[PDB]
Amino acid sequence: MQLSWKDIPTVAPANDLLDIVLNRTQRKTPTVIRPGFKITRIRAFYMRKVKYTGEGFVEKFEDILKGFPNINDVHPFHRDLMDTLYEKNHYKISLAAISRAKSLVEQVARDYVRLLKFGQSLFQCKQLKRAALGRMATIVKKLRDPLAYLEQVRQHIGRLPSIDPNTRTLLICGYPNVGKSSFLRCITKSDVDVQPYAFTTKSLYVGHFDYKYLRFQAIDTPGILDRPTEEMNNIEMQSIYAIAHLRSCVLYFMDLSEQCGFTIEAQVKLFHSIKPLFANKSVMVVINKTDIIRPEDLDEERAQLLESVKEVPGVEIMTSSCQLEENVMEVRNKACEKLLASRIENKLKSQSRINNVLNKIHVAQPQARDDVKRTPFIPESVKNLKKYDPEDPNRRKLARDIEAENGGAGVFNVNLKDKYLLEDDEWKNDIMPEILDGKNVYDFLDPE
């Protein structure tokens, strides 16, 4: 999988592409031909014109065709997302139009070079070359609509978030205005907008975090309305496909204060309606906005509704408030634990990754072999050393600080003799002689 498609070159519109390719021919090929030249030279001149223009068009079309993803060969989550966003039928039809234009341009170039082989005069050769280029221009101008569509699609698809469907995922779902973007802001550093009106978020947003040295992604979705898929719209279909495809831990958010504009009965009904969506995935129901109302001081009928939500195996109810750091961290950790348990238990049922995992998990241990004492050695100065604080008024000045205050890196000349541990500190800047009368001083230098 690729997960990102920002490296698609710019798609020019039809007239711009025509201008680019034709002017490239006029600039990069020679333009002066004389009627008094040899007919072979004239024919070569115009054949080169036709072949070069065809090659330019084919190069542009090939850059278009290689850049765009193959929608039927990507992961099915990406296929469904791109079908919702760009209408896969139109997408494939436009790219097929590009392919057909490439084939037709190649055919025109070959046919008119073969025809130019038999040109008898400069006028006839010029007419044939102009005919070839005009037919190429007609073919290219037939592509005016697919090129506009593909340029818009390229710009939009370069900005999609990179979602790995085979990593660890916390999905966030529910009605609008229940706190989904607020929770994503709390747990990640995604900049998803938080506003007190419905459908502020119209697309999938991704954040990341680390739990037990493991990278987790978190998907915040647009809200879903309690409607059948027949009258569901594309914005909600993004969330539907996210929940259907991404194997994950789903967090269904409920606002019991009814500040979201939806009743608790409606939220329970939506949960029971999208119950078939999250099967064999981890499920948890998070009650947001506990600083306004709480499950414990609700009504009896509403408590019965929440119990009916809890009835579905094997979901669990947890309270949270997007102004409560400890509680949002706790619910994040519980969801991560459920997801990790599911993944590890699934891998426990497999036999492929067993022996290597055991080898890389086993810690070898020694046993006796002698009555010799071997203990770690930590110097007293080391264990009395104070921790270095980069942001502190009274901190030890480092060698890089001295370098920067003297000359900076690559200009500062360190004196390596300043660290010498000698009997006399006046001996530090002493030049040690090396040669005396054809003898190395060092192999004579010896005590006694």
Partner: protein
């Protein structure tokens, strides 16, 4: 459909319900996983793993693209445009390997009035039942004649001549007919023409590509024969090993023939190889090459065996018919 002026807010073909939707998603995920396993058993184990190591395959040699030249195919289309009867010459050892299906389809589509027939040459290099079975199976599509081309001691010459006379009699109002010989290099087109003329009128050599331009030969007053250079139609399934073992390329211009010697071992019987080279006891191609080199005295300086030269000689023997081999014909029905 999409853009600033888009009016598509709902999917066109909505699913029935969430249960059908999740069933479809599970089916798609399973199909994707199975497809990934099937494609990664080959591609990711092969080409894509080399991209991590910065490795690139050796550049394809120009000797394997011989027979796909513009001059050669210009000659081919010239002789087809000039011919009334076209004789497609196949090798009796590998006729399906030596069939030019694209040229056959072009002839049956664009020029249906030209009569395409099969001549299965080099039938003396295969067992008689193999030649009979191949003739029977190819006769289900085209009139096929078994042949052994030789100026002095041939087979099938009278049958070919009487077939050509029948074609002339059918076209008795054309004042002459032309019979163009096409096929792979080294199938024996020039040898068949020499056999029909009972005289060496076209140059013949074991090396491929001896014939370069077309040649007119007057067989009878109303029958002309056209000699054409051999053609190798381009393809992607035809590997360099297949092309080399069809006798297409000149072996002296290949890089590492020791890499192709295992193909000889797979295509030849052990008893036939051991009878041809009077050696035995090898367990792989490298040991076979080394044993043959030491027996034949093909030593480099200091006593090292000349593996490349011995391998080239083995490939030449295989292609030129000093080692017996054939491809099994289709099973009898």
């Amino acid at each position: 459909a999409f853009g600033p002026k888009a009016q598509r807010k709902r999917p066109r073909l909505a699913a029935s319900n969430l249960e059908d939707l999740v069933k479809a998603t599970n089916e798609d995920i399973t199909k994707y996983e199975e497809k990934q396993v099937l494609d990664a058993t080959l591609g990711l184990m092969g080409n894509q793993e080399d991209k991590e190591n910065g490795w690139t395959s050796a550049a394809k040699e120009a000797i394997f693209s011989k027979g796909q030249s513009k001059r050669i195919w210009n000659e081919l289309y010239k002789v087809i445009d000039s011919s009334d009867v076209v004789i497609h010459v196949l090798d009796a050892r590998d006729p399906l390997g030596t069939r030019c299906k694209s040229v056959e389809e072009y002839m049956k589509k664009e020029t249906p009035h030209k009569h395409l027939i099969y001549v299965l040459n080099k039938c003396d290099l295969v067992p008689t039942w193999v030649a009979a079975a191949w003739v029977k199976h190819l006769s289900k599509e085209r009139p096929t004649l078994a042949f052994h081309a030789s100026i002095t001691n041939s087979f099938g010459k009278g049958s070919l001549i009487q077939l050509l006379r029948q074609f002339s009699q059918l076209h008795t109002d054309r004042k002459q007919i032309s019979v163009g010989f096409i096929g792979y290099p080294n199938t024996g087109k020039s040898s068949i023409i020499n056999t029909l003329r009972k005289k060496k009128v076209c140059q013949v050599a074991p090396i491929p590509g001896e014939t370069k331009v077309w040649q007119y030969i007057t067989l009878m007053k109303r029958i002309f024969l056209i000699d054409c250079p051999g053609i190798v139609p381009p393809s992607s399934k035809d590997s360099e090993e297949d092309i080399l073992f069809r006798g297409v390329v000149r072996v002296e211009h290949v890089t590492h023939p020791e890499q192709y010697i295992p193909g000889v071992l797979k295509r030849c019987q052990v008893k036939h190889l051991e009878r041809t080279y009077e050696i035995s006891g090898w367990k792989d191609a490298t040991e076979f090459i080394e044993i043959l080199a030491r027996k034949q005295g093909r030593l480099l300086k200091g006593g090292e065996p000349d593996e490349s030269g011995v391998s080239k000689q083995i490939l030449n023997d295989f292609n030129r018919g000093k080692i017996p081999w054939f491809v099994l014909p289709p099973e009898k029905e």
